[PDB]
Amino acid sequence: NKNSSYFVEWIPNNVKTAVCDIPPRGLKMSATFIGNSTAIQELFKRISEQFTAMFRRKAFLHWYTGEGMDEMEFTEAESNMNDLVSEYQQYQDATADEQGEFEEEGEEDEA
Amino acid sequence: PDLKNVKSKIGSTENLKHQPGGGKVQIINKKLDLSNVQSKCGSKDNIK
């Protein structure tokens, strides 16, 4: 309720709880978080923009093609990462939209 | 002396064809069909 705008709004109630009775050693209580933010796209943005700057120059690339990797292997990988990143944008801030397009009225003067 | 021609070896000069190129993404959405559906209780016609 305090933070609703950091949540994908077409996935209403975003939580899974589990509660074990048995604490960490010699201590009263704890909890463990596993979160799925879209903000994770910033790390794979970085690593794709970084890769791009080594790869459009053949930096370090002799060492890995030297272990037999074809240029298609790094290009499929980068493409694959880029697709994951393009998707993460398409999950981010998204609305409950239903994929319609602009339409207009006909006529009632039948022949 | 004369060198006639000489050039660098090997880097960004040998990369100038391959960008690489990008792609396109799409949703990830559907509907359901409602055209079969009627209520499953139903007494009000018994007025007949």
SS (H, E, C) A83-106: HHHHHHHHHCCCCCCCCCCCCCCC
* Residue in the structure block whose two tokens are 């509907």: B31
d(CA A34, CA A40): 13
Q: Determination method here?
A: cryo-EM
- List, as one string, the DSSP characters of chain B: ---------SSGGG-TT-----------------TT---S---GGGG-
A58, A71, A75 member nearest B10 (Cβ): A58
Contact with chain A for residue B29, Cβ under 8 A = yes
Q: Are A59 and B14 in contact (CB under 8 A)?
A: no
- What is the CB neighbour count within 10 angstroms for residue A41? 18
Q: Could you tell me the CA-to-CA distances from A33 to A15, A19, A44, A69 in Å, in that order?
A: 11, 12, 21, 38
Structure tokens at A71: 């240029």
Q: Which fold has domain A40-94?
A: Helix Hairpins (1.10.287)
CA of B2 vs chain A CAs: smallest distance (Å) = 31
Buried/exposed A78-103: b ≥16 CB within 10 Å, e otherwise: bbeebeebebbeeeeeeeeeeeeeee
Assess contact for B25 and A90: CB atoms under 8 A. Answer: yes
